[PDB]
Amino acid sequence: QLSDNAKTLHSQMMSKGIGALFTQQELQKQMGIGSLTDLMSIVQELLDKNLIKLVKQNDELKFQGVLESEAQKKATMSAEEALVYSYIEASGREGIWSKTIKARTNLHQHVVLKCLKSLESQRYVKSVKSVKFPTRKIYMLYSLQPSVDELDIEFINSLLTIVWRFISENTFPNGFKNFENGPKKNVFYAPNVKNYSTTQEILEFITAAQVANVELTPSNIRSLCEVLVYDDKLEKVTHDCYRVTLESILQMSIFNYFKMFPASKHDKEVVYFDEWT
Amino acid sequence: LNEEASKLKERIWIGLNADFLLEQESKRLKQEADIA
């Protein structure tokens, strides 16, 4: 019966719905009582009367009962937004770009942009710019914003040069760069005895905040370490152990780049680099 | 004019414009939605 088998076949949906994995085989598994065209003609109307839904993946076809507000909602949706919208909620947590959804619906740019404006009015979808190239405006629901992304923009250098400070502390005592030799003086007693680094500790150190951000994983902490490895501000020894490169002498014959200034005006005696390319 | 003709004239204005002001305040709610 339309209402009876609708509401009891939705009783498995609101009860469980076999998660999202429910296929027509799982229907027979629970309700096999209905004849083929019986359970089928009603289910087709359960999409027509918007009670359950179909999903296209892997083997067979998935199903679960749609909610009522989403039911009425997608009934309000246009014939475009029928496949467009209810396909975008199928575009899942990662959303989808446009002409790739055109390639699915086989339509022009105009006809899809207009239902993008209409669902824009719905505000159940939103413009989403992820890490990948911002020509996209991939569109996922406008209820969730999961993605792959720290953030792609700056003020990592800030928090870097912040941690570099404590890293300088991590090795010998503080700078003592006042006069030339004011270091540890044989490194306290036997720097051999000093095997030291922070790793996880930085987070206990990160507790200070004073900046707009969340915490960050020791893995990506190591990533932050990797640049000043490459920038040679620090040293990588025995994995999680680390050192300073005595960078500070930079911060403050000769072969250092800093502490060196050219004449570099008038006279033709210079060394440029490309005096021959 | 009296306060009655404002509670009546103005009333008619409101019965007419409640959708206009409704869209104003509604997009003003989209402001909250804009944030998220």
UniProtKB/Swiss-Prot annotation, chain A:
| Cellular component, GO annotation | cytoplasm; mitochondrion; nucleoplasm; nucleus; RNA polymerase III complex
Instruction: Look up keyword Transcription and say if it applies.
Output: yes
The organism is: Saccharomyces cerevisiae (strain ATCC 204508 / S288c) (Baker's yeast)
* Cellular location(s): Nucleus
> Member of which family?
Belongs to the eukaryotic RPC34/RPC39 RNA polymerase subunit family.
Summarize the impact of E80A.
Cold-sensitive. Abolishes interaction with BRF1/TDS4
What is the protein's name according to its record? DNA-directed RNA polymerase III subunit RPC6
Q: Write the lineage as a comma-separated list.
A: Eukaryota, Fungi, Dikarya, Ascomycota, Saccharomycotina
GO BP annotations of the record are:
termination of RNA polymerase III transcription; transcription by RNA polymerase III; transcription initiation at RNA polymerase III promoter; tRNA transcription by RNA polymerase III
The record lists the effect of D152H as: Cold-sensitive. Abolishes interaction with BRF1/TDS4
Tell me the subunit arrangement: Component of the RNA polymerase III (Pol III) complex consisting of 17 subunits. Interacts with BRF1/TDS4.
Q: What's this protein's function?
A: DNA-dependent RNA polymerase catalyzes the transcription of DNA into RNA using the four ribonucleoside triphosphates as substrates. Specific peripheric component of RNA polymerase III which synthesizes small RNAs, such as 5S rRNA and tRNAs. Involved in recruitment of Pol III to the preinitiation complex. Involved in the configuration of an initiation-competent form of RNA polymerase.
UniProtKB/Swiss-Prot annotation, chain B:
Q: Where in or outside the cell is it found?
A: Nucleus
What domain of life? Eukaryota
**What subunit structure does UniProt give?**
TFIIIB comprises the TATA-binding protein (TBP), the B-related factor (BRF) and the B' component (TFC5).
Q: What else is known?
A: Present with 4330 molecules/cell in log phase SD medium.
Assigned protein family? Belongs to the TFIIB family.
Q: What does this protein do?
A: General activator of RNA polymerase III transcription. Interacts with TBP. Binds to Pol III subunit C34 and to the TAU135 component of TFIIIC.
* Protein name, entry field: Transcription factor IIIB 70 kDa subunit
Query: What species is given as this protein's source?
Result: Saccharomyces cerevisiae (strain ATCC 204508 / S288c)
* Organism lineage string: Eukaryota, Fungi, Dikarya, Ascomycota, Saccharomycotina
Q: Report the gene name.
A: BRF1
Covered part of the full sequence, start to end and full length, is 475 to 510 of 596
